[PDB]
Amino acid sequence: NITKNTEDILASITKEYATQTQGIFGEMIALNKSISGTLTEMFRSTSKEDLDIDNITNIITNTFDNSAYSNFTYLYLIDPPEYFKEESKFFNTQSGKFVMLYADEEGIKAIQASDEIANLQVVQDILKKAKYGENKVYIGRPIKMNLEGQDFDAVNVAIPIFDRKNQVVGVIGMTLDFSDIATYLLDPKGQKYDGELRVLLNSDGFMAIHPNKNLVLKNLKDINPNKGAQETYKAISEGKNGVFNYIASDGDDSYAAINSFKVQDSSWAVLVTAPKYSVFKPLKK
Ligand SMILES: [Cl-]
């Protein structure tokens, strides 16, 4: 009865959270692909001497105007026309790199660009590895960012821009603030069991969302190494689904469900737990 039903409930809960999360990534990626296509067509068809800053601006703002899940949008150009830099101080990082960075107005507005964008792992990977003709989207792990004064937990999605010589000339990308995923993943209205943990992590174990904010960005395998957690970690590592006996980082002997999903070349999982004691002696709340 209760054990079987709890397992089935946890599988259902994780599936729904996974589906919703996968859809948000998919929407962001479709927008990024649209703009990367349009910008590459521009940079292939337009001489450097004829590059038009307002044409570029309008492509960005038109693409990202419609209430995206992306909290930020950026265009990094490695070697733009010099007049680009003179158009706005916001387009210049501290080291003089050219980054057009947009945040929500609430529509999008330019904000001061930072080298934090240019130094993102996805950006560096694109500059080093991207080749014309690939259909690749570069997706990061959960990281700390600070673009407007306050820290937030984020993941980045980015695509190269190319010119007619088939060279990378820039990167168009987006930042998702995991607070916006936490809005549903940690909604107290969704708490079914006492001590239930709802977690988003990548397949490597790095946590994007955990009820304990102190655990965000950490690897679950490092902070919860007990043998009673390892079966669950294997499922995550392998990109599988299932429901397991699991001993959580807070010590609670639990049922845990995993629903694993892929996003382009990245791999993620939703983990949801129910302490066994909560399942069998739930409190009247
Ligand atoms: Cl990154």
DSSP output for 106-120: --EEEE---HHHHT-
- What resolution does the deposited structure have, in angstroms? 1.4
Beta-ladder partners of 266: 263
Q: What is the 3-state secondary structure (H, E, C) of 217-245?
A: CCEHHHHCCCHHHHHHHHHHHCCCCEEEE
Query: Around Cβ 30, how many Cβ atoms within 10 Å?
Result: 9
- Sequence-ordered alpha helix ranges (H) in 164-275: 179-185, 220-223, 230-237
Question: How many angstroms does the Cα of residue 158 sit away from the middle of ligand 1?
Answer: 9
Q: Quote the CA–CA distance of 199 and 272 in Å, as a whole number.
A: 6
Q: Quote the CA–CA distance of 203 and 65 in Å, as a whole number.
A: 32
Nearest to 68 by CA among 193, 173, 192, 187: 173
Nearest to 140 by CA among 128, 118, 158, 116: 158
Residue 121's alpha-carbon distances to 62, 116, 157, 171, 265, in angstroms, are 27, 10, 10, 12, 15
Q: Quote the CA–CA distance of 45 and 165 in Å, as a whole number.
A: 11
Question: How many angstroms does the Cα of residue 157 sit away from the middle of ligand 1?
Answer: 8
Q: What is the H or E stretch that residue 75 is in?
A: strand 72-77
Question: How many angstroms does the Cα of residue 141 sit away from the middle of ligand 1?
Answer: 6
Residue found by looking up tokens 């002696």 in the block: 281
Question: How many angstroms does the Cα of residue 245 sit away from the middle of ligand 1?
Answer: 33
- With the C-alpha atoms ordered 221, 223, 224, 226, is the resulting torsion angle positive or negative? positive
Q: Quote the CA–CA distance of 204 and 62 in Å, as a whole number.
A: 35
AA letter at 238: E
Question: How many angstroms does the Cα of residue 197 sit away from the middle of ligand 1?
Answer: 26
Question: How many angstroms does the Cα of residue 69 sit away from the middle of ligand 1?
Answer: 17
Overall domain count for the chain: 2
Question: How many angstroms does the Cα of residue 227 sit away from the middle of ligand 1?
Answer: 31
Q: Quote the CA–CA distance of 161 and 127 in Å, as a whole number.
A: 10
Task: Give the domain-ending residue among 137, 161, 182.
Answer: 137
Q: Same domain, yes or no, for 159 and 275?
A: yes
Q: Same domain, yes or no, for 101 and 111?
A: yes
Q: What length is written for the chain?
A: 285
Nearest to 32 by CA among 213, 263, 277, 199: 263
Task: Give the domain-ending residue among 137, 165, 190.
Answer: 137
Task: Give the domain-ending residue among 111, 137, 163.
Answer: 137
Question: How many angstroms does the Cα of residue 9 sit away from the middle of ligand 1?
Answer: 34
Residue found by looking up tokens 């980015």 in the block: 158
- Around 30, how many Cα atoms within 13 Å sit in the side-chain half-sphere? 8
